[PDB]
Structure formats: structure tokens, C-alpha cells
Amino acid sequence: SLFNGTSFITLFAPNSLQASIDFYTNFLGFAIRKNSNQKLQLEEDQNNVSIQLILDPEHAASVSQIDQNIRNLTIQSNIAFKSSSLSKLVKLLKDGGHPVQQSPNEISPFEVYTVDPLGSLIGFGFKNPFAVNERVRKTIGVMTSGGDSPGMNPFVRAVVRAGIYKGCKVFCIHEGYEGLVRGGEKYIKETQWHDVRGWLVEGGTNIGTARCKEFRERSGRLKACKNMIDMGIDALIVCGGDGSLTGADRFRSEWPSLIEEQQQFNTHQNLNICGAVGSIDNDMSSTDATIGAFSSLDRICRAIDYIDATASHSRAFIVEVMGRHCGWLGLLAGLATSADYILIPEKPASSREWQDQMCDIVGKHRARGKRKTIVIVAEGAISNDLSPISCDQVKDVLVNRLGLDTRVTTLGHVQRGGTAVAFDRIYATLQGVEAVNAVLECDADTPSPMIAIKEDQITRVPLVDAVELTQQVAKSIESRNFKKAISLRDSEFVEHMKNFISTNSDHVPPSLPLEKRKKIAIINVGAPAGGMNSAVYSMATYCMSRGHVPYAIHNGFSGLARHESVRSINWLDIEGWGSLGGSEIGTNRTLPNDADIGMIAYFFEKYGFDGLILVGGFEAFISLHQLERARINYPSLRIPLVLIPATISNNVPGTEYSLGSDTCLNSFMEYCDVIKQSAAATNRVFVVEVQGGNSGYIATHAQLACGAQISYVPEEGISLAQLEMDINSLKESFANDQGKTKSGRLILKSENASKVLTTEVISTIIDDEASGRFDSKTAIPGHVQQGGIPSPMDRVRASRFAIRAVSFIERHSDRCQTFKNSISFRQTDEITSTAVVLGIHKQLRFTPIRQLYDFESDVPRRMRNIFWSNVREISDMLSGRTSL
Amino acid sequence: SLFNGTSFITLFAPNSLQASIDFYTNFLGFAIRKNSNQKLQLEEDQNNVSIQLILDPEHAASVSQIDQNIRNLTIQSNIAFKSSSLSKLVKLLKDGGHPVQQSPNEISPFEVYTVDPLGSLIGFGFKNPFAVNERVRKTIGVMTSGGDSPGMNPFVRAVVRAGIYKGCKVFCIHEGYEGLVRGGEKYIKETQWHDVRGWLVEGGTNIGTARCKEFRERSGRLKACKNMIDMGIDALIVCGGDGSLTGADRFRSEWPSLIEEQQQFNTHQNLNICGAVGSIDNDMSSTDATIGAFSSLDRICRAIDYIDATASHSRAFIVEVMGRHCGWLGLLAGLATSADYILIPEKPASSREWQDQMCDIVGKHRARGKRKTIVIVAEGAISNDLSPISCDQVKDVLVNRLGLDTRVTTLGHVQRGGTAVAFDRIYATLQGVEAVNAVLECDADTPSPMIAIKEDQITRVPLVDAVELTQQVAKSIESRNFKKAISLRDSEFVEHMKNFISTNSDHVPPSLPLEKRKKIAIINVGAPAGGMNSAVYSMATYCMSRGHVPYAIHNGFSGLARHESVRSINWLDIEGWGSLGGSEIGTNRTLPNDADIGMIAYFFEKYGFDGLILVGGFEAFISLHQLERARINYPSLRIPLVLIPATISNNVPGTEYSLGSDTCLNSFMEYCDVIKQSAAATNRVFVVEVQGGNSGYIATHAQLACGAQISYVPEEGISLAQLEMDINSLKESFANDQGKTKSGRLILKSENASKVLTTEVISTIIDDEASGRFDSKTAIPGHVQQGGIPSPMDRVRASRFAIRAVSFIERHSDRCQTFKNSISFRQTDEITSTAVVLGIHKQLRFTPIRQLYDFESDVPRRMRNIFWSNVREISDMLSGRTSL
Amino acid sequence: SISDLSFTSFVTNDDNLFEETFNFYTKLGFHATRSYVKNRSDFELTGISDSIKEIWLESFPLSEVVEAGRELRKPLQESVGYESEALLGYPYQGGVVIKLRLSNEKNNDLPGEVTFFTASIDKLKAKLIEIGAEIIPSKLVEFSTRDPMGDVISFSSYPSLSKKITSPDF
Amino acid sequence: TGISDSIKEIWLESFPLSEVVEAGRELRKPLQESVGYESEALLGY
């Protein structure tokens, strides 16, 4: 050759040169050569990189300035550099206020501009994978107060273990306040780690609750205070209801009871107190869900489901529901089971008599075809003038004003009994852990906390402020401001109240004017998930409520493209859909591009859809992206596209909660309980194969809810060293069972954790290593974990999300029709925002598909960054697991 | 809408109208409507297709003619039709003299032209998989003659069974001509199907051979003729050598020996005679390979291999080879084992004394570094003046003229002993089958045939013409025209002679002028295969012979792109490569596009390669296509690209023979023999798992060569019905073993035949169904079947192909440099022809990669239409298998 | 074995002619279902004979309109005579593909014409007088019209031409 | 590469200088069997 190499790049500056000298040195890693001849930029030693800068007037300030602004449109001769890990330089430029050009933003060539524009950077000569990247001590006291609430045992188990782990004596105050006031070894017993064995399954409270008359007065409050100082209890944890916590709050303010009658007064000077709501009611104001609320809701829905599971004219059914102060149970049961009329204290009849209101609503429903009328009566069922409405009162109206043979079903203690539902077990446990930390982290300047859940996230809220707020609600009801009382309840309550009345109301004129009425379609994509049918039911009934035309795309994208599966949704046909498992519409894993994308687009324009709601897993996630990317070709797709994640796995980015995961969690939790119970009957372990695919979410949560010793997850895998360590753990566990409760042992293994070390292989290794001291058996239930009848939570969440989806389509349809009716569509930012994923984040938010697909997902064969890391740490803590 | 549908297309004709009327009716299936008003074309009933034709002068003859020719460039408004299975119409148009335009030629929209041009046809509205496609008796006598030749038993086994199957009595004439002349039950025994049991493995001749002095005279020829008429033998099959068949030919012409001394003379009037060459010599002229030739060649190479497997200066080794008339064994052994000097009758020293010739060649080899000198001496080793050259003669020259300690190795009877090699078993068997058919198909007007192989294909050649031609060669040797004698031998012999002397001659000035000398590169792509190293050895030594620069691309495309693995080839470094197994260069399954195609292209131009030789399987096949398709981007790739198929599988289209398949076949055949022998020792079956992937070639051939009862192949699969039928066959087979030879039973199952019914599963089903009457055991050798030391056939074929590859690159390089030095490369037909696959077809031909990839292959995950269908039929015939 | 006619294609060199043709059928009841322009994201199914721009217009078939009394909307394939097939079933079935070639090369337009079916002959006649021209007929053809492309109009292979909402069988 | 789009693009290379091989015939380029060639994780020196 003759052009043998490349010595240096020569740049000419106007007259000033320094701005560029600062750029290439800070941004590129160059350096000024020692002792400058006039007033050379080399990179490093043992190299050949050089850039010459001359101040000779050969380049104009006016031309260069115009060229820089000219480039701000996303052609010119340039120079490219060989540089490893371009990703780091791109971030450094962008954040430094410099624009950059790149290939997939993953990335291949990077290109920026200085006073000397178009300074390119390549990561290699020709196409190939790139150049490799270069180089504190205090003793705790637990108590339970008020009526039995499922989840109280899981909470106490958590407090006993958490406190023990944090290195402090845990005392269980038997018979709540009574035990606290009476004191002594009789009621205040020191609790060990093995003493709270298998309490997850146990119903009610093993410690016990008692209504203490003395503690209501300063007489008892003082006696209780003495008993704590005598027992050496430095901190109190109360798990109970409203008054149960208000009484604890009063005890907190009244704590300065120095009473001379100083060593002890010096040490035990401040009251470390923490609250957790142990109620079925869900009446406490600063939390979204109280411990026992969803299990109670579950008992109610279990009864309503059995009632609906039959034939018949002239029949009405009354479900008498426990829950004295709040209407949350009534409202949510009513929503989950699509009840005709609910009698709750927050929404009594106002413009007309409750009998007239009920008869009208019930009548309209029967008239349109609904033969099984279900009426839910709250314990706090009341009229305007605060007169309590009884079941018999309601029964006589149905029997005498209408011709209905009414049969009353009253749950009673059923609503407090049984094991805590997966949500209650997971949440009560984490609350127990938090209550301990809160109590330890507490300082005299910190206001006494109450552990609260705020949109699936554990938080600390001041107990005084929560006590005050609940009183404010009670005041609003008593002062007859029900509209106010409703707004004073949590944002979920107000949304559910709105969701229920709208879905309950096709049989009343539409709420939108003719112009604002649209054509919204719904599809189910992926494997079935509990709530798919509920999302469809709620969306269709809400559409009818607004005046929209709800369309159902039967059997996913394959059904639309190959068979024109656009079908109308009739209110009578969808009767009981909210309670049905699977997908009535029909779901499959077929992607829009695996079905004809042109045909999907053709039918979208033929039926003139104003929006689309996708209910499904990762395939529905890819589907969104595939439909969004096809918008350039098809104007028919330039409409709001919304995804409501539905997978038992919880592998879809954008949400922290996917529809059907609670249904699935609960069915597997019920399965694991039976398996552990069986292990408890025989020195045996069970290796339980878990579903969820490449997502370790279900095994994580099942480990916490069931008390499994280990959970093998796809994100971590299974190492031989960890397997040997964990087997030695089992060896020691059984050697230490001599004396303690026989609760049984579980190991949960997600099928994807190891392709080699399978459930069956793992178990045979345990037997080999066990040397006859114990045995191992597998439990492989299979891809049946989906579950039938969806959980009340799933039915309720699906309703909420389906409505938020319709409401988004309402908002964005006007903007879309600009891109729809126009060609020359250049695929802007205003349009990409309409193709979105509805999700829970800490907040319920819609996230554009673009950011989640490109950045938040393993788009490839994995189909899945996790959030459940803390849950994992706690479940290993609670079971004594040692990682590597 | 307003444009509600499409009624009809209206066409205007010039004045004449009839040409188009004939087109749309014959080509499209239209019909003229009854009773025309002036002098409508509808398709069919219950439809809506119509084309209106008017003769009004609205369309000009000059304009329309110009438009038709204008379209002959591969834009105008057109009409498309909905039509199922476009492939059938495209063929009907093209063959009818009408050009057509289509999407992948697989195909999506079809477009042709009439007097009314641009008549389009779509197979659906929008993109999606298309609309579904609408709606004779004579008793045979076998004999063997001449010296023992491996494969004589497999041949006789074949004749006995084939003849039995075709419904005729088979007699085995013991002691050849002696038995035929003596006659009687003593020498002419009736043979049954079970009497030739396990003869595949047996060496020599179970019937026996004898030199009959009497048959040389008319005295014996008459006695033999009587014995055939007395035994009622209507047809004779001779399996022997040259004279052995010449004597049969003389007996054929002398057959009219009516001799009065008429019932028998009327019936037994004509001699049905068929010949097959049973010789190790390979001296017979009308066949490419005689039965026993490759087994004998194998014995020789086995000895040479052992000799080469040692250290040392002043050492020479003489291999005394059996083979009196021909030099084929000497030449092929010399080629397969890269011998220094060969003494064969066709190529005696001419321009100088044989001692001077030998010493010069040997000397040059030792001088360049080769320490182990191997000299092969033929039985027919001769000088110019026809003086026979002995081993001792050769030994004294090496010991006295050079200072070499010479050790002679003489094979003797070793060269006739042992089992027939896979090639001999497969070919002798098929020849036996053909010999029977030939004998039955024979008519008095048809000249007596001899069964011959012509480039891996069984043919019939007139015995007289073959006998005459062999004598012509002997005449040329005796008349001292060796150059003539060489040309008189088969085309493979002349090519091998050329191949050997060129590869034997780096140490002599190049055979090409400076201008005609090129830079040729070689790669190995896929899994290793016997002959990969031989193809490299032969190509490098041939390159040096021509004056080319041979380059080796180490470790496939990954090695080139990521590591610049271009390496020179030194003669001394490649010593013994022709005999080494695997790939010395390094092979992998990495494709040019899975490695950097731009980087491959960069190094191709950096090193300025004038051509490329790919040695490998299906990945090397895809590689060719990937390199061919990248030619548009890279001028560096616009050079001849040649693929020499190398797979044990034989899945590459273009050849009927892939390098390494004989090495593999023989190793598996040796394995199966031991397994069947083991079955024979114990009422047992063996299910033997076979390699070759999705290609059923190896199991097909192993079934034939080993005598397996069944072979389960991926192309057919394994049905439960066939499995039950085959198991019942085994049940009956063992029930009938009472009395016959215990030869053992095999079932060969290609791993890909069934994913569910696996070797292990199949065998357990056999045991279940066997009900203790016999057992089943598996034999799973594994992916070891590759084999070390490649077969002499593989070493030889690889040499031949490597040279044909270099020679193709020589021919096409000049044409390529036009496309190489030029941009505006539009990817013509002259260039696509240079990217080719070297192959055997019936003919040794180069096939352009385009036709084999697009049309002849399962490009996808299958990596594979078969030719071996007949082989399959025969192996089922010979084992009594009943298919479904 | 051709079922019917898939679509008609009209190719032009002039962009001004192309856009004016698009707007012509847009006023006549056509809807652009697919669009193309010279970006690597665009899907390719048709583009020869290449093309710089391509607009696929569809005048959707007539189906049995649904009552809900509010304003009238299209039904589904829960319609009167809908018979589901292996692919799509069995509705008055017309799409016209408009293609745009480069600056340069390209054949001249030949004399042939297409006749489309309309169940609103007078309603179409009225839009044409409200827009373009109305050519007088010869031979089933009711009338004819033009743009750079001349087209004919009549009734389909059935006896007569607008009852979209059909009479359910007994 | 095609931005910044492009109608035509030609990539020219003036190849590096390596240690030429003698074979006496005419001079040809060596391989990376050359003098100071040190093989790296990717290509060498």
C-alpha cells in the first residue's frame, strides 16, 4: 500500500480553540503536550492517537455555529474512533449536554459534535460482536386485641422470629390488655423461635384476645405500665382493631406516669410502641388493607359462589355480612360476586327510601333477565336517619313488595375462622418483621408508628394521625355526611364504590353524550389467568354504563386474522363471568405477526375500533409492541392500545401485580399446606416443583406463605455447593427436631431453577446424603396451578384495571384520530404514548410499551429485573437458610 | 360504502380478440357465454367472475405489441385474481410459453400478460399464510471361481435369497467349474433361505472354487452342459475373475452343443448366463470396482498404517502387494498411504532405469525431510522390456545404492482373508440381487450380461465386450504401450494415476506459468469426517505441484473472523495427514453470518484469495450460500467457492457420497457384527441406536451390510402399528429358529426416528411383548461412530475431489475477476455458477449452490429427498420384513 | 381455479396525479387501510412493478347493520347468512391498490376498464356531479367516470342492486 | 452504515503492511505466523 496508516487529525479554530480543548480532554481522555510552541492533543503512552489544534483563521465562527444548529435534525464528512464500551461514553455526553446518534441504543457506532462537528466512535473494521470492554438490644412484647382476624398467628410468628434474629427477648402477652393489666408469668410468657412453629396455617390467635374493662380507665393503664417495667419489656407491639389501637395511642400519651409510690424510671422512661391492624373490617384509615380483611372477604365470596352455583323464578338470596363500622367487605363482595343490591353504611339511600331504591335496582335486574337476585346486608347496614336496617327488614321487602321466596345466609364466626389467605399470610408476616424494626429504630423524637400497606407496599404511618382519621370518618357517618365519609376512606374504596355502581348500572341511559361514545375491543392473549373473565365482564358493563359498544375478539389474534372473531357482548350472556375461571372469550399464545398483522389491521378498520384492551401475559406484552410498531403501515392501529397484565407467573414488566397471581398463589399455598401436613405426620422432606416459568415470583411468595425451608428460583439457579449446604441444613434440622413441634419440611423448586438438578434428581440426592436419618419425596402437581374460581382480589383488581383501561382509551382517542385520518405518519412521541401497559408501581400508572420492551425486559426466550429480593431475604431469615 | 363490489373487467380488442379468447379459456378456465350478440367470458356457476371482450377499435395493435415487449425486463396498472395453489398455474404458464413474476418462487402473487397485459393472481386481502389448495420361473445355479475374494459369501447369500423370493430353486455349484463338470448331488446342492445365514461376516467362499482342467477343453464344456440339463438348471450365475468369466463367455458361444447321443433339447435350448466380478485385482475393464477389491486395498493400507506408526534415519520399507495383472491396488494404496515410489505394470520407468527413477524420487523425499520411505511392489511389477521386478531386486537397490536398512512386509493370503468391507458387502449383495433379475429378464435376443458398478451405480454391461476390453489392456502391456494401457483402464484409474504423480511431485518446478498461479484457501466446516485431512493434504500438495499458494483457514469461520486464522501449508508439516482422522485445521459448526461476514470478506481481500474450498457437512453447505449471497456487498467474495461434502450422515444435497460416510459405515458395521455375534451366543434381540441425525442413510446401509432385521429411519418414523407388527415378526422369527443357524438379531434405530419411542423404550416394549420367549437389550455406542484412521476409499475419494476443486477454481478465476474489480455488480448468472457443490450423481458434477439450497434441501432445522429407497426395499426383502 | 377478483392496481409516475387520485376515491367512500414510503420499520408485501409510495384503499363490504333507538352501527359475523369456513366464512364483498413509481422506466396506460357494483347508482351519480365527471354508458354498465383512470359502474353477477339488513330464513 | 440516508456507499481499504514472504519466485504477503505477532482475545499485534 501507500496510505500505510493514520498519523493525526488536524483541526483549525477561529482566532478563542479552548472550548474544544476542554471537550476532547474531559470527554475523550486526551491531554495537552508539554511546553507548547504556540500559546498537540495526545491520548496515552504506547499508542498512536493524536489531534492537532491550530488557532489560524481558516474556520469561521458564523459558518461553524450554523453547521452545529444544522445538525440538530434527527449529512457531513467525519472521523471515527475505535473505543470499547460505547454505552459509558454516550451517557457521559448526553448528561454533559451533548446530543448523540447510535444504532440500537444497545449500542454499535456513537456520534457527537464539538466546535469541530461529527466526532464518530465505532466499537470494533466490519460487522461482528464488538471489541471487549477494557478493565437495638431492647426486649419486645407482642399482644393481639379485638375479635379473631385470620393472619394474627402469621403476624405473631413474624414478630417472635424477627425480634429473636435481631437479638432480643420476645414476650407474648396472653389475653391482650387483660394480660397486660394483670401481668405476671401467667400472662407474659417468654417465647422461643420453635414455639411459633406452623402458626402460618393456624386460625385466630394462639396468644388470645380479651376485652379489658380496667385498661379503659387510668386505674388499669397504670397497672399495665408497672407490669411492663417489672417484666423489663422495653417495647410494645399491638396487633388489633380501631379502639384496640386508639387505647394503645391513649396509653402512649398517658405514658408519663412517673408515679412515686430511680433506676427503673431512668431506663424505662419512654414507651416504644408499634401498631398493626388486625381487623376483618378494613375500617382503619391510613392502611389500604387490614390483616384479616381479604380472608374475611374470601369466606363471604365462598358462600356467594355456592349460592350462585344452582338454577329459578321468584328467588332472592340475602347474605348477612359481619363488619360493624365499614362497608368495604359488603362493597368488595358485591363487586367480586356482581350482587344486585348492597346495604352498606357509607352509601345509604338518599333521594328515596332504601326499599324503593332496592326494589327498583332488583326489579330492573330481574326484568332484564337475571333470575338469581343476591342482596348483601352489612352488620352496619343503616338508613339516612342512622336507623339500623336488619336482615328480616330486607327479607320482608323482598317477600312482600316483590314475590320472591327469600333465603338468608349468615356467615357469623365463619368470617373470622380458617387459615389466612396467601395475601394475609404474606402481608401479616412482613408487617411483623417491619413492626420489630420500627420498634428498634424508634427514638423519643419519632412519633409512634402503625404498620400500613399502601398499594401493595409496606409503609410506616403515625398511629395518632391514623386514629384521628378513622374518627373523622365515623364523625361523617354520625353527622350524616355519607358523600364526605366515602371520600375520607382510602382512594381504592372511592374507586371501588364508583366501579360497582357503574358496572351495576346497561339498564339506565348512557353517562356520555352521543359524540363521546366509542367502539372498544377486548382480547385475551397467552395462557388463561384468573381475572381474564372479570376484566371482560367489568369492561363490557362499564362500556354499556358510558354508552360505548364493547366488542370481544374471540380466541386471540389467530381467531381474528384467520376467522373474523369480532363478537358483540350482551349483558345477559356475560352473567356470572366475573366469578368464572379461565377465558370465556378464548385465549392463545399466537402473536399478531404469527397471525396476519394486515388482517388484524383490516378488521380493526372494518369494525372501526376506537381502542383495544389486551388482557394477558408476556405474549400480550409482545403483541402490544408488534401492534405499536405496525402503526406506520396501518392507520387502523393508530388508536389507544392498553395491556392489563394477566399471568400466574408475574413475568410482565410494567406491573408488580399480574391478574391471576393471587388465585395461583392461593391454590399452590393450599397444596403446600397439605404436603407439609403429610411431612409432619411421617422425618421427611418434600421437594415441591413450582410453576411460573423463568419468573421466580410464585416460589418466593409460596416459601413465605407456607414456611418452606428453601425455594430454588430461576434467577439464582441451583449450585452443587448450595445444594450440599442446604442438604446439611436438613440433616441438622431433623437432628434438632428432638423436642420441638413436628410441623414438616418443604423445599420449593421452580421447574426453571435447574434443567439438570430436577425435583426428582434433587430428592434422590437428599435420600443418598440423608443416610437413613430421614427421607425425601417429591410433589409435582403440574400445570394445573392456574385454578378455577378466581380469588376475590383478582375479581376486584380486574374490575378496577378494566375501568382504568376504558377511561384511558376515552382520554387518548381524540389525539389518535389525527394520526388515524392522516397519511405522512412519521411515528411521533404523541402517538407512541397511546400504546401502553397498565401497572402497579410502589402508584397505579400507564407505561408506554417502548420503554418497557427496549429497556425493562428479556425480550428473548427468557420472557422476563425482579422486585421481590427483600421478600426472599426475610423468608430465608424466618427458616434459617444460609446462602453462598 | 358506494363501491360495493367488483362486477367485471372490460377489455377492448383491435378490429382479430381470438388469441386472448383462447388464452383466458385454456389458461384461466373461463368459458364463452351462450348465443353471442356480436360474432362474455364467465368462469363457473355459483360465482361472480366475469371478463367482457369487445372488438371495437379502441386499443391499437402497434401500442399493445410495443407494451408486451416493454414488459420483457425482469410498470403498468393491473387486475389481480383470488386463486388457490398458484404454483400449478405458474408451471402451466411458463411451459405454455408465458413469462411470470412471483415473490419467493414458493410462491405468493403470480403475474403474466396476454394481448391484455398484466393479469395478476394473489393467493389470499392482506399478508398471512395463503388460501388452502382446492380438491420368470427358471431354476438358478450359482458358482464361484478363481482365488478367494472378500464379498463372495455376501454375493451368494444375495443370489440364494433373491432367487428364492422371485420364486425359483437356487442350486449352489460347489468347487466352481470342477463341480459343474463332475456334476451330481455331490457338487450341485439345492440351497434354502436359512442356509446362507450370517454369510455377510464369513470370509472367502463357503461354496468353494476349483481350477477345472477339463472345462478348458470341449471335453469338459460338454460334460458341464449335460449336468445342467440333468439338474434342470435353466440359468447360470458365475462370480469370479477375468479368465473365470472368459471361460463362461466361451461356454456361452459354444452352448449350441445339440449332440445327438428331443424333450430336453427343446426346453434347455438357450443358456441364461450372468457374470459378476469376484476379484481383488480390479483388472476387469467394464466395471469401476470388482468384488473384493476394496477389502484387499483395506488389508494393504492396514499394514502400511502400522508401518507408518513408528519413529529414524537409514530406514526404508517394502510392501509386497498381491495383484498379478492390474496396478489398481498398488496405485490406490500408494495414494491412500502417500507412498514414495510404486512399482505397478501400467507405469514402468521409461526415460530412465527404474532404479534411477526410484532412487531419484526416494532421494528427493528424504532430502526434503521425509524419514519413513515406503515403496510398494505389485505382483505384476515390471520393467519397460517386460522383465518382472522382484522385491529382493528392489531391496538391494535400497540397501546398496542408498544406505537404507530395508524391511520387507508381504501380505500374501491376508489380502484375500477377512470379512468383506462395508462397500464390498453392500455392493456384492446388490450385485447378487441384480444378477438374479438379469438372469430372469433375459431373452435369447439379449446379450449375456455382466454386473458392473459405474460411479457408485449398479449397471448391466455385455460380458463379451468386457472380456474383449480386458484382453485389449493386456495386449497394450505386452505390446509395450503403457500410456495406451493406462487410457484403456477406467476413467477413475487414469485420474488416480494423474492425482498420485502430481501429489507425489513441491519438489519439482511448478506445472503452470507465473501468470496462471493463484492463492487458494481451504476451510473445514461442521463436525469432523474421515477425509477432511486427506482433502487438505491432496489440495496443498496439488497446489505446490501447479505453483499455487495453499492457505488453511484454521477453526472454521469463527477462527478467521475473531482471530485471523489464515495459515500457510508446509509440505513437511502435513506429513501423514492423508491417513489422520478428524480435522488438523480445526472444524466447527459456526456459520459465516454467526462469525463476522464483513471480517471474512476483509481477510479474503487482505490475503487476496483467488478461490475457496469448503470441506464439511450441512453447515459448510449453508456457509457456501451465505458467502454466495454476500457477494453483492463484498467484491472479495466474487471468486470460485467449492464445497466437498464431508459428513458421516450424508445429508448434504449435490452428492450421493459424502466424505467420511464409508469410514463411519465400516466402524458401525464392525460394531454391529460384534453385537449380532453376542445375540447369536444367547433368543435375544439388540436395538442398536444409529447416528447420522435427520438423515437415514447410515442405518439403511448398516442394515444391508450387517443383516439387521429392521432399521428405523427419520424419514419414515416409527408407528405403533409397525412396532407391533415388527415385534410379532421377532416372536415368529425365534419360534422358527428351531433347527436353523443361530446368527443373532438386530434392529437398527436412528436416534431421530422417534423422540418418544427411543432405543431404550423400544427395547422395554419388546421384553413386555416377548412374554419370556426371548429378551431385548439395547446397544447405544454414541457420537464416537466418526472413527479414527479414515477408510482407504475416503482417503482416495478426498484426493480426487480436492484436485477437481482446485481445477474448477483454475477454470473460473478469470471470469470472476471481472465482477471482483468492478462495482455495479448486479449478481448475474455467470457469477452464481462459481459458488458450487462438487458431487456424485449416477457422473461427477459441480452443481450451483442456488438450485440445491432453494429447491433440493430442508434448509430449516431438519438439515436434509432421499435416493436410498431401493437399498431399503432390498434389505427388507433379504430379512423378511413386512411394512404398512 | 380463480374464485373472484382480488383488487385493481393503478400505477403512476406523477406524484401530483397520485395524490389527486387518492383524494378522488377518498371522497367516493374509500378508506386507506395500508400505506408505504421510501426508515427500515415499514413492512413489505407489495412494491413491484419499484414503488416510492403506495396507498391501499378499501370500500368495505356491506353487512347487516345493528339497530341500537340510537344511531346505526355494523354487525359482526353473528349476521344472517354467515357460514364459517376453514379460513373466513360467507355480505356484498371492493379494494383498489394505488402505486407510485420513481421520477423515471414506466409503461403507458392501456385501454381496458373495470366495472364495479353499486346498490346506490343515483347516490354515486350525485357525488360524481358534486365532484368530477359522468360519462354516458355502452353495453350492464349504468354509466362511467374518470381521473387519470377511466372506470365503469353497474350491478354485480346477481339480478339487482340497498337492503344491507337481510331477511332471516324460516 | 447508511446514516448520516445514503443512495450509494463504497468502503475502500489501503491494507496494512506485513512481513512479505520470499518464495526464487515473486514476493507474496505473510500470515500471522509473522515476526512480532502476539495473538490477543480478539485479533493480535
Ligand SMILES: Nc1ncnc2c1ncn2[C@@H]1O[C@H](COP(=O)(O)OP(=O)(O)OP(=O)(O)O)[C@@H](O)[C@H]1O
Ligand atoms: N346500594 C346499591 N347497591 C347496588 N347498586 C346501587 C346501590 N345504590 C345505587 N346503585 C346503583 O346506582 C344506580 C342509580 O342509583 P339511584 O337510581 O338510586 O341513584 P343514586 O345516586 O345511587 O341514589 P341516592 O341519591 O338515593 O343515593 C342503580 O340503578 C344501581 O346501578
Ligand SMILES: Nc1ncnc2c1ncn2[C@@H]1O[C@H](COP(=O)(O)OP(=O)(O)OP(=O)(O)O)[C@@H](O)[C@H]1O
Ligand atoms: N512410480 C512412481 N511412484 C511415485 N511417484 C512417481 C512415479 N513415477 C513418477 N512419479 C512422480 O513423477 C515425478 C516425475 O517422475 P519422472 O521425472 O521419472 O518422469 P516420468 O514422465 O513419470 O517418467 P518416465 O518418462 O521415465 O516414465 C517424480 O519425481 C515423482 O514425484
